[PDB]
JSON list of C-alpha atoms and ligand atoms in Angstrom, two decimals:
[
{"chain": "A", "resi": 195, "resn": "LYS", "atom": "CA", "xyz": [144.14, 39.97, 78.23]},
{"chain": "A", "resi": 196, "resn": "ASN", "atom": "CA", "xyz": [146.58, 39.52, 75.36]},
{"chain": "A", "resi": 197, "resn": "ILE", "atom": "CA", "xyz": [146.34, 41.94, 72.43]},
{"chain": "A", "resi": 198, "resn": "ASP", "atom": "CA", "xyz": [148.45, 43.07, 69.42]},
{"chain": "A", "resi": 199, "resn": "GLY", "atom": "CA", "xyz": [151.34, 40.86, 70.47]},
{"chain": "A", "resi": 200, "resn": "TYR", "atom": "CA", "xyz": [151.29, 42.20, 74.04]},
{"chain": "A", "resi": 201, "resn": "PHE", "atom": "CA", "xyz": [150.24, 40.46, 77.25]},
{"chain": "A", "resi": 202, "resn": "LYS", "atom": "CA", "xyz": [148.61, 42.81, 79.74]},
{"chain": "A", "resi": 203, "resn": "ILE", "atom": "CA", "xyz": [147.82, 42.05, 83.38]},
{"chain": "A", "resi": 204, "resn": "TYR", "atom": "CA", "xyz": [145.47, 43.92, 85.70]},
{"chain": "A", "resi": 205, "resn": "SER", "atom": "CA", "xyz": [144.78, 43.35, 89.37]},
{"chain": "A", "resi": 206, "resn": "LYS", "atom": "CA", "xyz": [142.86, 44.21, 92.52]},
{"chain": "A", "resi": 207, "resn": "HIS", "atom": "CA", "xyz": [143.05, 42.98, 96.13]},
{"chain": "A", "resi": 208, "resn": "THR", "atom": "CA", "xyz": [139.81, 43.96, 97.78]},
{"chain": "A", "resi": 209, "resn": "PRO", "atom": "CA", "xyz": [139.16, 42.32, 101.17]},
{"chain": "A", "resi": 210, "resn": "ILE", "atom": "CA", "xyz": [135.98, 40.25, 101.44]},
{"chain": "A", "resi": 211, "resn": "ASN", "atom": "CA", "xyz": [134.14, 38.45, 104.22]},
{"chain": "A", "resi": 212, "resn": "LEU", "atom": "CA", "xyz": [131.40, 36.77, 102.16]},
{"chain": "A", "resi": 213, "resn": "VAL", "atom": "CA", "xyz": [132.93, 33.34, 101.70]},
{"chain": "A", "resi": 214, "resn": "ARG", "atom": "CA", "xyz": [130.25, 31.75, 99.51]},
{"chain": "A", "resi": 215, "resn": "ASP", "atom": "CA", "xyz": [130.79, 33.46, 96.16]},
{"chain": "A", "resi": 216, "resn": "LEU", "atom": "CA", "xyz": [131.56, 36.69, 94.33]},
{"chain": "A", "resi": 217, "resn": "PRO", "atom": "CA", "xyz": [130.28, 39.73, 96.24]},
{"chain": "A", "resi": 218, "resn": "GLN", "atom": "CA", "xyz": [128.22, 42.44, 94.63]},
{"chain": "A", "resi": 219, "resn": "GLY", "atom": "CA", "xyz": [130.21, 45.63, 94.31]},
{"chain": "A", "resi": 220, "resn": "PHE", "atom": "CA", "xyz": [132.31, 47.50, 91.81]},
{"chain": "A", "resi": 221, "resn": "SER", "atom": "CA", "xyz": [136.09, 47.60, 92.13]},
{"chain": "A", "resi": 222, "resn": "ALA", "atom": "CA", "xyz": [138.15, 49.07, 89.32]},
{"chain": "A", "resi": 223, "resn": "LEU", "atom": "CA", "xyz": [141.22, 47.16, 88.15]},
{"chain": "A", "resi": 224, "resn": "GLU", "atom": "CA", "xyz": [144.56, 48.93, 87.70]},
{"chain": "A", "resi": 225, "resn": "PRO", "atom": "CA", "xyz": [147.17, 47.84, 85.16]},
{"chain": "A", "resi": 226, "resn": "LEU", "atom": "CA", "xyz": [149.70, 45.92, 87.21]},
{"chain": "A", "resi": 227, "resn": "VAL", "atom": "CA", "xyz": [152.20, 45.23, 84.43]},
{"chain": "A", "resi": 228, "resn": "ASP", "atom": "CA", "xyz": [152.65, 44.93, 80.66]},
{"chain": "A", "resi": 229, "resn": "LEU", "atom": "CA", "xyz": [154.97, 42.33, 79.15]},
{"chain": "A", "resi": 230, "resn": "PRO", "atom": "CA", "xyz": [155.48, 41.67, 75.37]},
{"chain": "A", "resi": 231, "resn": "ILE", "atom": "CA", "xyz": [155.60, 37.97, 74.52]},
{"chain": "A", "resi": 232, "resn": "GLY", "atom": "CA", "xyz": [153.32, 37.85, 71.47]},
{"chain": "A", "resi": 233, "resn": "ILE", "atom": "CA", "xyz": [152.26, 34.19, 71.23]},
{"chain": "A", "resi": 234, "resn": "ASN", "atom": "CA", "xyz": [149.52, 32.02, 69.74]},
{"chain": "A", "resi": 235, "resn": "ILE", "atom": "CA", "xyz": [148.07, 31.53, 73.21]},
{"chain": "A", "resi": 236, "resn": "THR", "atom": "CA", "xyz": [144.88, 29.46, 73.01]},
{"chain": "A", "resi": 237, "resn": "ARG", "atom": "CA", "xyz": [144.88, 27.38, 76.20]},
{"chain": "A", "resi": 238, "resn": "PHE", "atom": "CA", "xyz": [145.14, 28.13, 79.88]},
{"chain": "A", "resi": 239, "resn": "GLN", "atom": "CA", "xyz": [145.73, 26.51, 83.25]},
{"chain": "A", "resi": 240, "resn": "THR", "atom": "CA", "xyz": [146.20, 27.55, 86.85]},
{"chain": "A", "resi": 241, "resn": "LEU", "atom": "CA", "xyz": [148.73, 26.30, 89.41]},
{"chain": "A", "resi": 242, "resn": "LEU", "atom": "CA", "xyz": [147.66, 25.40, 92.94]},
{"chain": "A", "resi": 243, "resn": "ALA", "atom": "CA", "xyz": [149.91, 24.82, 95.93]},
{"chain": "B", "resi": 534, "resn": "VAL", "atom": "CA", "xyz": [160.11, 76.74, 84.29]},
{"chain": "B", "resi": 535, "resn": "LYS", "atom": "CA", "xyz": [156.76, 77.15, 86.02]},
{"chain": "B", "resi": 536, "resn": "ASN", "atom": "CA", "xyz": [154.07, 79.84, 85.94]},
{"chain": "B", "resi": 537, "resn": "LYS", "atom": "CA", "xyz": [155.21, 81.11, 82.55]},
{"chain": "B", "resi": 538, "resn": "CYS", "atom": "CA", "xyz": [154.14, 80.82, 78.93]},
{"chain": "B", "resi": 539, "resn": "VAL", "atom": "CA", "xyz": [156.77, 78.30, 77.83]},
{"chain": "B", "resi": 540, "resn": "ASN", "atom": "CA", "xyz": [156.80, 75.97, 74.85]},
{"chain": "B", "resi": 541, "resn": "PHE", "atom": "CA", "xyz": [157.05, 72.50, 76.33]},
{"chain": "B", "resi": 542, "resn": "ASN", "atom": "CA", "xyz": [157.86, 69.03, 74.99]},
{"chain": "B", "resi": 543, "resn": "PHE", "atom": "CA", "xyz": [157.23, 66.18, 77.44]},
{"chain": "B", "resi": 544, "resn": "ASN", "atom": "CA", "xyz": [158.20, 62.67, 76.35]},
{"chain": "B", "resi": 545, "resn": "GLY", "atom": "CA", "xyz": [157.84, 63.92, 72.82]},
{"chain": "B", "resi": 546, "resn": "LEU", "atom": "CA", "xyz": [154.27, 65.14, 73.51]},
{"chain": "B", "resi": 547, "resn": "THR", "atom": "CA", "xyz": [154.98, 68.81, 72.41]},
{"chain": "B", "resi": 548, "resn": "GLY", "atom": "CA", "xyz": [152.74, 71.94, 72.62]},
{"chain": "B", "resi": 549, "resn": "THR", "atom": "CA", "xyz": [152.72, 75.43, 74.26]},
{"chain": "B", "resi": 550, "resn": "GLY", "atom": "CA", "xyz": [151.24, 76.36, 77.65]},
{"chain": "B", "resi": 551, "resn": "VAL", "atom": "CA", "xyz": [151.78, 77.57, 81.18]},
{"chain": "B", "resi": 552, "resn": "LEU", "atom": "CA", "xyz": [153.00, 74.77, 83.43]},
{"chain": "B", "resi": 553, "resn": "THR", "atom": "CA", "xyz": [151.94, 74.94, 87.06]},
{"chain": "B", "resi": 554, "resn": "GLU", "atom": "CA", "xyz": [152.26, 72.44, 89.88]},
{"chain": "B", "resi": 555, "resn": "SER", "atom": "CA", "xyz": [148.99, 70.60, 90.40]},
{"chain": "B", "resi": 556, "resn": "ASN", "atom": "CA", "xyz": [147.02, 69.33, 93.39]},
{"chain": "B", "resi": 557, "resn": "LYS", "atom": "CA", "xyz": [145.28, 66.54, 91.47]},
{"chain": "B", "resi": 558, "resn": "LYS", "atom": "CA", "xyz": [146.63, 63.17, 92.58]},
{"chain": "B", "resi": 559, "resn": "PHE", "atom": "CA", "xyz": [147.48, 60.80, 89.74]},
{"chain": "B", "resi": 560, "resn": "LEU", "atom": "CA", "xyz": [147.31, 57.07, 90.22]},
{"chain": "B", "resi": 561, "resn": "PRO", "atom": "CA", "xyz": [150.75, 55.44, 89.94]},
{"chain": "B", "resi": 562, "resn": "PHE", "atom": "CA", "xyz": [150.30, 54.04, 86.45]},
{"chain": "B", "resi": 563, "resn": "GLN", "atom": "CA", "xyz": [148.66, 57.08, 84.86]},
{"chain": "B", "resi": 564, "resn": "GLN", "atom": "CA", "xyz": [150.90, 59.37, 82.85]},
{"chain": "B", "resi": 565, "resn": "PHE", "atom": "CA", "xyz": [148.90, 61.87, 80.75]},
{"chain": "B", "resi": 566, "resn": "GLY", "atom": "CA", "xyz": [145.82, 63.59, 82.09]},
{"chain": "B", "resi": 567, "resn": "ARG", "atom": "CA", "xyz": [142.89, 64.69, 79.96]},
{"chain": "B", "resi": 568, "resn": "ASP", "atom": "CA", "xyz": [139.91, 67.03, 80.08]},
{"chain": "B", "resi": 569, "resn": "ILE", "atom": "CA", "xyz": [136.17, 66.64, 79.51]},
{"chain": "B", "resi": 570, "resn": "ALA", "atom": "CA", "xyz": [136.68, 67.49, 75.84]},
{"chain": "B", "resi": 571, "resn": "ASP", "atom": "CA", "xyz": [139.72, 65.18, 75.74]},
{"chain": "B", "resi": 572, "resn": "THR", "atom": "CA", "xyz": [142.37, 67.90, 75.75]},
{"chain": "B", "resi": 573, "resn": "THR", "atom": "CA", "xyz": [145.74, 67.33, 77.40]},
{"chain": "B", "resi": 574, "resn": "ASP", "atom": "CA", "xyz": [145.68, 69.31, 80.62]},
{"chain": "B", "resi": 575, "resn": "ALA", "atom": "CA", "xyz": [147.93, 67.41, 83.04]},
{"chain": "B", "resi": 576, "resn": "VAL", "atom": "CA", "xyz": [151.29, 65.83, 82.26]},
{"chain": "B", "resi": 577, "resn": "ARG", "atom": "CA", "xyz": [153.51, 63.92, 84.67]},
{"chain": "B", "resi": 578, "resn": "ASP", "atom": "CA", "xyz": [157.10, 65.07, 84.68]},
{"chain": "B", "resi": 579, "resn": "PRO", "atom": "CA", "xyz": [159.40, 62.23, 83.56]},
{"chain": "B", "resi": 580, "resn": "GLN", "atom": "CA", "xyz": [162.70, 63.06, 85.26]},
{"chain": "B", "resi": 581, "resn": "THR", "atom": "CA", "xyz": [161.04, 63.96, 88.56]},
{"chain": "B", "resi": 582, "resn": "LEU", "atom": "CA", "xyz": [157.70, 62.31, 89.26]},
{"chain": "C", "resi": 922, "resn": "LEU", "atom": "CA", "xyz": [87.93, 90.02, 99.69]},
{"chain": "C", "resi": 923, "resn": "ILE", "atom": "CA", "xyz": [89.84, 90.76, 96.48]},
{"chain": "C", "resi": 924, "resn": "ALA", "atom": "CA", "xyz": [92.99, 91.67, 98.37]},
{"chain": "C", "resi": 925, "resn": "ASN", "atom": "CA", "xyz": [93.03, 88.37, 100.25]},
{"chain": "C", "resi": 926, "resn": "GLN", "atom": "CA", "xyz": [92.55, 86.43, 97.04]},
{"chain": "C", "resi": 927, "resn": "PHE", "atom": "CA", "xyz": [95.34, 88.40, 95.41]},
{"chain": "C", "resi": 928, "resn": "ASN", "atom": "CA", "xyz": [97.75, 88.01, 98.33]},
{"chain": "C", "resi": 929, "resn": "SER", "atom": "CA", "xyz": [97.11, 84.28, 98.60]},
{"chain": "C", "resi": 930, "resn": "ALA", "atom": "CA", "xyz": [97.53, 84.02, 94.84]},
{"chain": "C", "resi": 931, "resn": "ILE", "atom": "CA", "xyz": [101.07, 85.41, 94.95]},
{"chain": "C", "resi": 932, "resn": "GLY", "atom": "CA", "xyz": [101.84, 83.04, 97.81]},
{"chain": "C", "resi": 933, "resn": "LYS", "atom": "CA", "xyz": [100.87, 80.10, 95.63]},
{"chain": "C", "resi": 934, "resn": "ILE", "atom": "CA", "xyz": [103.36, 81.26, 93.01]},
{"chain": "C", "resi": 935, "resn": "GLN", "atom": "CA", "xyz": [106.23, 80.93, 95.46]},
{"chain": "C", "resi": 936, "resn": "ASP", "atom": "CA", "xyz": [105.50, 77.30, 96.29]},
{"chain": "C", "resi": 937, "resn": "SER", "atom": "CA", "xyz": [105.07, 76.22, 92.68]},
{"chain": "C", "resi": 938, "resn": "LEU", "atom": "CA", "xyz": [108.38, 77.89, 91.85]},
{"chain": "C", "resi": 939, "resn": "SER", "atom": "CA", "xyz": [110.03, 76.99, 95.16]},
{"chain": "C", "resi": 940, "resn": "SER", "atom": "CA", "xyz": [109.39, 73.25, 94.92]},
{"chain": "C", "resi": 941, "resn": "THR", "atom": "CA", "xyz": [108.90, 72.29, 91.26]},
{"chain": "C", "resi": 942, "resn": "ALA", "atom": "CA", "xyz": [111.40, 73.15, 88.53]},
{"chain": "C", "resi": 943, "resn": "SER", "atom": "CA", "xyz": [109.36, 71.72, 85.63]},
{"chain": "C", "resi": 944, "resn": "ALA", "atom": "CA", "xyz": [107.59, 75.07, 85.21]},
{"chain": "C", "resi": 945, "resn": "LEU", "atom": "CA", "xyz": [110.89, 76.81, 84.42]},
{"chain": "C", "resi": 946, "resn": "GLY", "atom": "CA", "xyz": [111.83, 74.25, 81.80]},
{"chain": "C", "resi": 947, "resn": "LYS", "atom": "CA", "xyz": [111.67, 76.54, 78.79]},
{"chain": "C", "resi": 948, "resn": "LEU", "atom": "CA", "xyz": [114.54, 78.73, 79.97]},
{"chain": "C", "resi": 949, "resn": "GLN", "atom": "CA", "xyz": [116.60, 75.66, 80.78]},
{"chain": "C", "resi": 950, "resn": "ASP", "atom": "CA", "xyz": [116.30, 74.22, 77.28]},
{"chain": "C", "resi": 951, "resn": "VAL", "atom": "CA", "xyz": [117.93, 77.27, 75.69]},
{"chain": "C", "resi": 952, "resn": "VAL", "atom": "CA", "xyz": [120.87, 76.70, 78.01]},
{"chain": "C", "resi": 953, "resn": "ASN", "atom": "CA", "xyz": [120.89, 72.96, 77.42]},
{"chain": "C", "resi": 954, "resn": "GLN", "atom": "CA", "xyz": [120.57, 73.05, 73.63]},
{"chain": "C", "resi": 955, "resn": "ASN", "atom": "CA", "xyz": [123.18, 75.78, 73.37]},
{"chain": "C", "resi": 956, "resn": "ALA", "atom": "CA", "xyz": [125.65, 74.31, 75.86]},
{"chain": "C", "resi": 957, "resn": "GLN", "atom": "CA", "xyz": [125.22, 70.93, 74.21]},
{"chain": "C", "resi": 958, "resn": "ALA", "atom": "CA", "xyz": [125.86, 72.38, 70.76]},
{"chain": "C", "resi": 959, "resn": "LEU", "atom": "CA", "xyz": [129.27, 73.59, 71.89]},
{"chain": "C", "resi": 960, "resn": "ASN", "atom": "CA", "xyz": [130.19, 70.16, 73.23]},
{"chain": "C", "resi": 961, "resn": "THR", "atom": "CA", "xyz": [129.53, 68.68, 69.81]},
{"chain": "C", "resi": 962, "resn": "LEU", "atom": "CA", "xyz": [131.65, 71.42, 68.29]},
{"chain": "C", "resi": 963, "resn": "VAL", "atom": "CA", "xyz": [134.55, 70.87, 70.67]},
{"chain": "C", "resi": 964, "resn": "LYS", "atom": "CA", "xyz": [134.40, 67.09, 70.43]},
{"chain": "C", "resi": 965, "resn": "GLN", "atom": "CA", "xyz": [134.82, 67.30, 66.66]},
{"chain": "C", "resi": 966, "resn": "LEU", "atom": "CA", "xyz": [138.42, 68.38, 67.19]},
{"chain": "C", "resi": 967, "resn": "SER", "atom": "CA", "xyz": [139.19, 64.86, 68.37]},
{"chain": "C", "resi": 968, "resn": "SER", "atom": "CA", "xyz": [138.03, 63.36, 65.06]},
{"chain": "C", "resi": 969, "resn": "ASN", "atom": "CA", "xyz": [140.55, 62.08, 62.53]},
{"chain": "C", "resi": 970, "resn": "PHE", "atom": "CA", "xyz": [138.61, 63.10, 59.40]},
{"chain": "C", "resi": 971, "resn": "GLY", "atom": "CA", "xyz": [140.52, 60.45, 57.50]},
{"chain": "C", "resi": 972, "resn": "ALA", "atom": "CA", "xyz": [143.96, 61.63, 58.58]},
{"chain": "C", "resi": 973, "resn": "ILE", "atom": "CA", "xyz": [146.77, 60.00, 60.50]},
{"chain": "C", "resi": 974, "resn": "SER", "atom": "CA", "xyz": [146.20, 62.00, 63.69]},
{"chain": "C", "resi": 975, "resn": "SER", "atom": "CA", "xyz": [143.58, 64.36, 65.05]},
{"chain": "C", "resi": 976, "resn": "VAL", "atom": "CA", "xyz": [146.14, 66.43, 66.94]},
{"chain": "C", "resi": 977, "resn": "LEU", "atom": "CA", "xyz": [147.48, 69.09, 64.61]},
{"chain": "C", "resi": 978, "resn": "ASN", "atom": "CA", "xyz": [150.84, 69.47, 66.36]},
{"chain": "C", "resi": 979, "resn": "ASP", "atom": "CA", "xyz": [151.46, 65.75, 65.93]},
{"chain": "C", "resi": 980, "resn": "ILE", "atom": "CA", "xyz": [151.11, 65.99, 62.16]},
{"chain": "C", "resi": 981, "resn": "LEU", "atom": "CA", "xyz": [153.34, 69.05, 62.16]},
{"chain": "C", "resi": 982, "resn": "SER", "atom": "CA", "xyz": [155.92, 67.29, 64.30]},
{"chain": "C", "resi": 983, "resn": "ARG", "atom": "CA", "xyz": [156.33, 63.90, 62.69]},
{"chain": "C", "resi": 984, "resn": "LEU", "atom": "CA", "xyz": [156.21, 64.63, 58.96]},
{"chain": "C", "resi": 985, "resn": "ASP", "atom": "CA", "xyz": [157.52, 67.50, 56.81]},
{"chain": "C", "resi": 986, "resn": "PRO", "atom": "CA", "xyz": [155.33, 69.83, 54.72]},
{"chain": "C", "resi": 987, "resn": "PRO", "atom": "CA", "xyz": [155.23, 68.33, 51.21]},
{"chain": "C", "resi": 988, "resn": "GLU", "atom": "CA", "xyz": [153.49, 65.19, 52.44]},
{"chain": "C", "resi": 989, "resn": "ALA", "atom": "CA", "xyz": [152.22, 66.88, 55.61]},
{"chain": "C", "resi": 990, "resn": "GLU", "atom": "CA", "xyz": [150.03, 69.07, 53.40]},
{"chain": "C", "resi": 991, "resn": "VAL", "atom": "CA", "xyz": [147.83, 66.15, 52.40]},
{"chain": "C", "resi": 992, "resn": "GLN", "atom": "CA", "xyz": [147.30, 65.28, 56.06]},
{"chain": "C", "resi": 993, "resn": "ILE", "atom": "CA", "xyz": [146.51, 68.83, 57.17]},
{"chain": "C", "resi": 994, "resn": "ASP", "atom": "CA", "xyz": [144.26, 69.57, 54.21]},
{"chain": "C", "resi": 995, "resn": "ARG", "atom": "CA", "xyz": [142.05, 66.72, 55.33]},
{"chain": "C", "resi": 996, "resn": "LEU", "atom": "CA", "xyz": [141.81, 68.07, 58.87]},
{"chain": "C", "resi": 997, "resn": "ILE", "atom": "CA", "xyz": [140.86, 71.54, 57.69]},
{"chain": "C", "resi": 998, "resn": "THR", "atom": "CA", "xyz": [138.09, 70.32, 55.41]},
{"chain": "C", "resi": 999, "resn": "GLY", "atom": "CA", "xyz": [136.78, 68.16, 58.21]},
{"chain": "C", "resi": 1000, "resn": "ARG", "atom": "CA", "xyz": [136.84, 70.80, 60.91]},
{"chain": "C", "resi": 1001, "resn": "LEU", "atom": "CA", "xyz": [135.62, 73.57, 58.62]},
{"chain": "C", "resi": 1002, "resn": "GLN", "atom": "CA", "xyz": [132.38, 71.74, 57.84]},
{"chain": "C", "resi": 1003, "resn": "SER", "atom": "CA", "xyz": [132.00, 71.09, 61.55]},
{"chain": "C", "resi": 1004, "resn": "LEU", "atom": "CA", "xyz": [132.36, 74.80, 62.23]},
{"chain": "C", "resi": 1005, "resn": "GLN", "atom": "CA", "xyz": [130.00, 75.69, 59.39]},
{"chain": "C", "resi": 1006, "resn": "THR", "atom": "CA", "xyz": [127.32, 73.29, 60.56]},
{"chain": "C", "resi": 1007, "resn": "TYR", "atom": "CA", "xyz": [127.57, 74.66, 64.09]},
{"chain": "C", "resi": 1008, "resn": "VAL", "atom": "CA", "xyz": [127.07, 78.25, 62.98]},
{"chain": "C", "resi": 1009, "resn": "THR", "atom": "CA", "xyz": [124.17, 77.38, 60.71]},
{"chain": "C", "resi": 1010, "resn": "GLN", "atom": "CA", "xyz": [122.69, 75.73, 63.77]},
{"chain": "C", "resi": 1011, "resn": "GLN", "atom": "CA", "xyz": [123.07, 78.94, 65.75]},
{"chain": "C", "resi": 1012, "resn": "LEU", "atom": "CA", "xyz": [121.61, 81.23, 63.11]},
{"chain": "C", "resi": 1013, "resn": "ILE", "atom": "CA", "xyz": [118.49, 79.09, 62.94]},
{"chain": "C", "resi": 1014, "resn": "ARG", "atom": "CA", "xyz": [118.18, 79.00, 66.71]},
{"chain": "C", "resi": 1015, "resn": "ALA", "atom": "CA", "xyz": [118.84, 82.72, 67.04]},
{"chain": "C", "resi": 1016, "resn": "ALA", "atom": "CA", "xyz": [115.80, 83.54, 64.93]},
{"chain": "C", "resi": 1017, "resn": "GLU", "atom": "CA", "xyz": [113.65, 81.29, 67.08]},
{"chain": "D", "resi": 1101, "resn": "LIG", "atom": "C1", "xyz": [147.34, 29.16, 66.37]},
{"chain": "D", "resi": 1101, "resn": "LIG", "atom": "O1", "xyz": [147.37, 27.75, 66.39]},
{"chain": "D", "resi": 1101, "resn": "LIG", "atom": "C2", "xyz": [146.09, 27.15, 66.18]},
{"chain": "D", "resi": 1101, "resn": "LIG", "atom": "C3", "xyz": [146.24, 25.65, 66.36]},
{"chain": "D", "resi": 1101, "resn": "LIG", "atom": "O2", "xyz": [145.68, 25.12, 67.56]},
{"chain": "D", "resi": 1101, "resn": "LIG", "atom": "C4", "xyz": [145.56, 27.53, 64.79]},
{"chain": "D", "resi": 1101, "resn": "LIG", "atom": "O3", "xyz": [144.22, 27.08, 64.69]},
{"chain": "D", "resi": 1101, "resn": "LIG", "atom": "C5", "xyz": [144.01, 26.25, 63.55]},
{"chain": "D", "resi": 1101, "resn": "LIG", "atom": "O4", "xyz": [143.82, 27.01, 62.36]},
{"chain": "D", "resi": 1101, "resn": "LIG", "atom": "C6", "xyz": [143.53, 26.22, 61.19]},
{"chain": "D", "resi": 1101, "resn": "LIG", "atom": "C7", "xyz": [143.33, 27.18, 60.04]},
{"chain": "D", "resi": 1101, "resn": "LIG", "atom": "O5", "xyz": [144.33, 27.04, 59.04]},
{"chain": "D", "resi": 1101, "resn": "LIG", "atom": "C8", "xyz": [142.29, 25.34, 61.42]},
{"chain": "D", "resi": 1101, "resn": "LIG", "atom": "O6", "xyz": [142.07, 24.48, 60.31]},
{"chain": "D", "resi": 1101, "resn": "LIG", "atom": "C9", "xyz": [142.44, 24.52, 62.70]},
{"chain": "D", "resi": 1101, "resn": "LIG", "atom": "O7", "xyz": [141.24, 23.81, 62.96]},
{"chain": "D", "resi": 1101, "resn": "LIG", "atom": "C10", "xyz": [142.76, 25.45, 63.86]},
{"chain": "D", "resi": 1101, "resn": "LIG", "atom": "N1", "xyz": [142.90, 24.71, 65.11]},
{"chain": "D", "resi": 1101, "resn": "LIG", "atom": "C11", "xyz": [141.90, 24.54, 65.98]},
{"chain": "D", "resi": 1101, "resn": "LIG", "atom": "C12", "xyz": [142.23, 23.77, 67.22]},
{"chain": "D", "resi": 1101, "resn": "LIG", "atom": "O8", "xyz": [140.77, 24.98, 65.76]},
{"chain": "D", "resi": 1101, "resn": "LIG", "atom": "C13", "xyz": [145.56, 29.05, 64.62]},
{"chain": "D", "resi": 1101, "resn": "LIG", "atom": "O9", "xyz": [145.11, 29.45, 63.33]},
{"chain": "D", "resi": 1101, "resn": "LIG", "atom": "C14", "xyz": [146.93, 29.63, 64.98]},
{"chain": "D", "resi": 1101, "resn": "LIG", "atom": "N2", "xyz": [146.89, 31.09, 64.91]},
{"chain": "D", "resi": 1101, "resn": "LIG", "atom": "C15", "xyz": [147.03, 31.77, 63.78]},
{"chain": "D", "resi": 1101, "resn": "LIG", "atom": "C16", "xyz": [146.96, 33.26, 63.90]},
{"chain": "D", "resi": 1101, "resn": "LIG", "atom": "O10", "xyz": [147.18, 31.21, 62.70]}
]
């Protein structure tokens, strides 16, 4: 999430064994890092090995 | 100073109270605790975590 | 015969009280309404009341009196009504 000119990142690494889709459950997400770029970000892509 | 009515200023927070070492276990990111009524009760010491 | 009816009657009181709490509701409400009324009172402290900060020490710390007055005077008016409304709540409830 990017807000007030700041780009925040949260994370979680729960282990799963249900390979089909998202498991039911409730894991909180901690703030991993905050880093202040402040950009007109409107598009998005991922990078795959 | 611990266990004593001392006026304290933490990270520019300010206020007066009696500072005692606490058993509650903060998560790594968290810095300032709070109460049910949203009153500062726990503060994490900057110089020594 | 009367004794046995009376003794069994008292026994029935235990079970109704022992198992079901709904009978004792009326006493609980006085605790709930009162204890709740305090929470509203305490929570009001964390309200800005149209001022820069709800925390009084913050306003004292950052800005000096001549302009700090306008900030504090808003907090007092805000809290004072909150206190007044809480007491007027209690006086009404106390009569009841
Ligand atoms: C960030 O850049 C985008 C361009 O992709 C701006 O979006 C345009 O805004 C104008 C308004 O003046 C619209 O007429 C365009 O249609 C918008 N583009 C799209 C693709 O819809 C956007 O306004 C910029 N951010 C800010 C804060 O100005």
